[PDB]
Design a protein around this ligand. Sequence first.
Ligand code: SRM
Ligand code: SRM
Ligand SMILES: Cc1cc2nc3c(=O)[nH]c(=O)nc-3n(C[C@H](O)[C@H](O)[C@H](O)COP(=O)(O)OP(=O)(O)OC[C@H]3O[C@@H](n4cnc5c(N)ncnc54)[C@H](O)[C@@H]3O)c2cc1C
Ligand code: SF4
Ligand code: SF4
Ligand code: SF4
Ligand code: SF4
Ligand code: SF4
Ligand code: SF4
Ligand code: SF4
Ligand code: SF4
Ligand code: SF4
Ligand code: SF4
Ligand SMILES: O=S([O-])[O-]
Ligand SMILES: O=S([O-])[O-]
Ligand SMILES: [Ca+2]
Ligand SMILES: [Ca+2]
Lengths: 155, 310, 309, 154
Amino acid sequence: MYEWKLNEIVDSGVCARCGTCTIVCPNGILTFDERPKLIDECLRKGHGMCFEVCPRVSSAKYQIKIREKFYEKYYYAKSDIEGQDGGVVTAFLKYLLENGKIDGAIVVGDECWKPVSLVVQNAEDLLKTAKSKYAISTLDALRKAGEMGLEKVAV
Amino acid sequence: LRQLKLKRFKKEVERRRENNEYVSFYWTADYGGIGKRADGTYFIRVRAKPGGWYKPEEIKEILDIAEEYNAKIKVTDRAGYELHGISGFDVEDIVLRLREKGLLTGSEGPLVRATLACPGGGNCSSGLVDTTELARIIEDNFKERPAPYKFKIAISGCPNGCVRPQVHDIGIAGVKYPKVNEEKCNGCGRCAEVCKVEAIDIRGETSYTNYNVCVGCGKCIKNCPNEAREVKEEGYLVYVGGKTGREVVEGVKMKLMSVDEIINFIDKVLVVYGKYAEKPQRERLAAVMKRVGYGKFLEEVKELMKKEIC
Amino acid sequence: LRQLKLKRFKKEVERRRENNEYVSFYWTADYGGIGKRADGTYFIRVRAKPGGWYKPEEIKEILDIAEEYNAKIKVTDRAGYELHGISGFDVEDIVLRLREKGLLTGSEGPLVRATLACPGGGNCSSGLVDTTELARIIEDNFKERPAPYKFKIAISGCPNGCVRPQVHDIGIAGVKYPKVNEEKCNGCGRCAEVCKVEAIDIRGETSYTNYNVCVGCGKCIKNCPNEAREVKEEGYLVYVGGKTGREVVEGVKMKLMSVDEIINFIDKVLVVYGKYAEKPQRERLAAVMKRVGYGKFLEEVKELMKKEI
Amino acid sequence: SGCPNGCVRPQVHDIGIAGVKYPKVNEEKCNGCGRCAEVCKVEAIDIRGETSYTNYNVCVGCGKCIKNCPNEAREVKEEGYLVYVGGKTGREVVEGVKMKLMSVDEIINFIDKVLVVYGKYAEKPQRERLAAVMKRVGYGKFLEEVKELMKKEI
Ligand code: SRM
Ligand code: SRM
Ligand SMILES: Cc1cc2nc3c(=O)[nH]c(=O)nc-3n(C[C@H](O)[C@H](O)[C@H](O)COP(=O)(O)OP(=O)(O)OC[C@H]3O[C@@H](n4cnc5c(N)ncnc54)[C@H](O)[C@@H]3O)c2cc1C
Ligand code: SF4
Ligand code: SF4
Ligand code: SF4
Ligand code: SF4
Ligand code: SF4
Ligand code: SF4
Ligand code: SF4
Ligand code: SF4
Ligand code: SF4
Ligand code: SF4
Ligand SMILES: O=S([O-])[O-]
Ligand SMILES: O=S([O-])[O-]
Ligand SMILES: [Ca+2]
Ligand SMILES: [Ca+2]
């Protein structure tokens, strides 16, 4: 078989099924639908950045928090866009695209409620993704955005 | 909702423990001073207290935790504490318990490590400057501050460098240089005996100092029975770009600095270090200074120091 | 008679204390690890235990003394303990009390200071050799041994030198150098990522090591997923003539040594150091080695090492 | 080099030779005139009352104090060729290690054996200087072998 270090995290059920490990593979030998899968032999046996970005191997929150210096400001809002709740996430993505703050938005769309990771560069296409998908989602569109050559994105 | 999710998490971790299922203790990286031992257990590093001074209540808490969890007690060469043999299930409980008693876990990772200070002035008979308050000021301003790689500061009370200021990212050493008062000096010869570097020359009815050898220990001023030796220059001598570990790099002697100047200098050096660092967790300050040039690096540090208004 | 004279002495010291008469605590120099603070009181230095490991019973005793005498507790950078604010009247009582619990006072004066060792093998994930037992062997053979000036030994478990082997009178560092097995190496590139010194080159279906950069941390052997890296050379790398303090002197890299060789080497370096030292309490090993010459000094150390066997 | 002033840089050469002449004071002849301390560039001499002393931790063995003593109170303590090995300059500076005083025959034997051990352990011709090979195998191990080969010559 083809050995993969992250199999212990996946087989134990600790895996968050976030899909971060598969988008970072520089050989594109990892795919993600509802769980990580090797489509080819890994020469490192998974001893690489798929294992190192995994939030279930190590959170790395302390080193990230002291650099990000997060704070907490609580607000609530609603927008003209119809969304899951107030449609705030879509309204914010629409604003960032329209004001040239991002080249594209990494959002979750759907086909029969099956989540689909998409790269959105137009506001009209944002409306189709404005709703919660409670099925497992992926971050696959971030890899597509990279192949497209997009400089900045919102996820 | 946060508490309901945390309770569900605690329930699942306990269930896995009871059924001998695999657990990845990924949340241990939420805290500072956490490391994994060769045997699979963890060690918790208490960030060293300024000057290596610990209250009996502080040591007693470490002793209670060690006995309760059957952990080994280790003392570090930066005068810190480490609790070895901690299970991943108890790491978070111990860190929060230590935090309540003021014992912050840290001095680990790419950040400013525990400041190392000697007893110095008021404690050591060779001490020329206060080291305990300076260490507290530096700890209050930069403790656990992120950097491209580990950053270590040492404060020595005199030029004997007990805490190695010459091989630290930033080294501070107390200095007191002498000058001879010819009206009071009678060539008794006592000062030459207290000088370890042998910088003094006794000639007839007077004495001299070789300033290329003198390290400014001030022993000759203190031990002159005729008060013929006076303070020429005094203060905190600063070094920058020192390092030890895989390789030894001697820090460069800068100049005498006031406490406010030292705080400004430490901050600016960190800013210029972060600006020019290309490889986090590999490049120490010395490597970044060498690559961009000491002159270019230090002239930027000076420009930023002049701009400082707080 | 010895006890009668001691009782008379104790009676006179107590009488002076009660009448506020001057007392010179000259007998404090009968013990090791004693120093005088700037304020007139004393500090008692407990010779650091090997590896900085302390039993709970030991730390509790230091805590009891500190609270009884209202003394401050200081931790040293050699992982030792110091009790500050001790009165000259209580110094002797505290030293003998500490001695009963196995806490010898020392690591002070012109002698072999407390041996500094890191957790090393079995404790630290980077550890390549055992440092705790080696530190115990060195402590048992040379603790408090007289020398022309202070003599400091440091044992590191790997080349990261956490206890600074390159600037110690004698420095020991665990090393594990790699060699590549071309039949198993496939150029996956994982070894180059674990190398802090960047000594590895990944080329096609193989990998190489620059031995002018490699420090022998053995991380590439340990972290190779295909077991393609093997041990080329392994053991304790030794350094001599290093120091810190007023000036920095880097020790000279000698060679790999067995534990018996290390003990023989430490003993013979001390013998040749004592033979050539001219100024006790001023000349460190590095100064004596520099004055007589490193070649001449080390040649004699080797001749004495051969005579031991 | 003919003296410790190292005009041809013996401390940064693969093999460096420097002439040295260390002093010793004859108390019967020394009167504390103070002339020797003036000719010492390193300031290793101390003039005290009717005598003089030398700090051997500073003295470089230039022999100026022996030559310029008007009362012939300074004599030769030790004399000869001081040898250094493993030094270099160029892309990086490496200071050579001070070995010991050597006779001319010893120097020739030493140069030959350092070249033999250098050739035996060098892995990268045109890249590794003696200093790099000495550092990689260890100065102790390298010099121990040089000595073993030197003994076999005789
Ligand atoms: C505990 C301690 C040794 C001791 O016995 O006291 C220690 C222990 C470790 N050191 Fe260290 N270092 C310790 C002081 C040092 C010092 C001296 C100092 O800081 O005063 C040095 C050299 C001085 C310097 O760095 O300027 C030192 C040089 C390293 C290095 C190589 C650093 C370099 O830049 O070359 C590493 C690994 C790395 O950075 O790649 C390292 C890494 C480590 C790690 C965390 C191994 C690792 O990479 O994860 C070791 C933890 C093992 C354990 O069980 O504790 N340790 N380490 C010291 C912790 C003091 C503290 O409380 O903060
Ligand atoms: C406590 C400690 C500083 C600390 O905060 O940890 C310390 C404290 C003193 N040192 Fe030290 N030295 C201490 C480690 C060092 C180190 C580092 C080390 O050894 O690990 C150095 C530089 C490293 C080295 O020497 O290789 C150091 C370099 C000195 C020197 C300069 C010696 C030299 O060769 O340049 C002196 C004075 C002297 O020897 O002339 C000195 C002398 C002293 C004295 C005893 C001053 C004196 O002559 O009476 C200081 C006692 C003050 C006090 O209250 O403790 N101390 N001293 C360290 C005791 C560790 C221990 O348990 O043994
Ligand atoms: C699985 C899931 C569980 C949630 N659980 C809670 C909860 O317990 N409590 C709570 O208060 N809120 C929860 N939320 C958030 C809530 O459902 C809304 O998404 C949120 O309030 C924002 O709504 P909005 O109208 O402002 O955004 P909208 O304008 O509707 O935009 C929604 C955005 O969510 C993204 N999205 C949708 N599904 C996914 C997915 N599976 N993964 C990643 N992105 C996705 C879309 O791409 C879009 O950009 C959950 C969301 C999800 C997806
Ligand atoms: S180790 Fe590298 S090549 Fe292999 S699966 Fe992980 S990211 Fe991909
Ligand atoms: S990165 Fe996410 S999907 Fe991949 S193994 Fe880790 S938790 Fe699972
Ligand atoms: S550096 Fe100076 S003041 Fe500080 S402990 Fe050492 S001798 Fe004392
Ligand atoms: S101890 Fe004082 S009076 Fe005596 S020689 Fe020195 S400076 Fe002059
Ligand atoms: S200050 Fe110290 S080093 Fe300088 S001359 Fe006086 S005793 Fe010597
Ligand atoms: S010297 Fe090596 S084995 Fe010892 S504590 Fe440091 S990293 Fe670990
Ligand atoms: S990690 Fe192992 S298999 Fe991969 S390139 Fe390095 S030596 Fe070869
Ligand atoms: S042993 Fe260490 S320094 Fe040497 S090539 Fe391997 S990882 Fe690099
Ligand atoms: S020059 Fe000669 S006589 Fe004069 S002090 Fe020197 S050694 Fe003595
Ligand atoms: S031989 Fe030269 S360096 Fe030595 S004391 Fe005489 S003049 Fe000074
Ligand atoms: O723990 S070491 O990195 O200071
Ligand atoms: O007393 S200091 O030299 O360890
Ligand atoms: Ca390379
Ligand atoms: Ca002099």
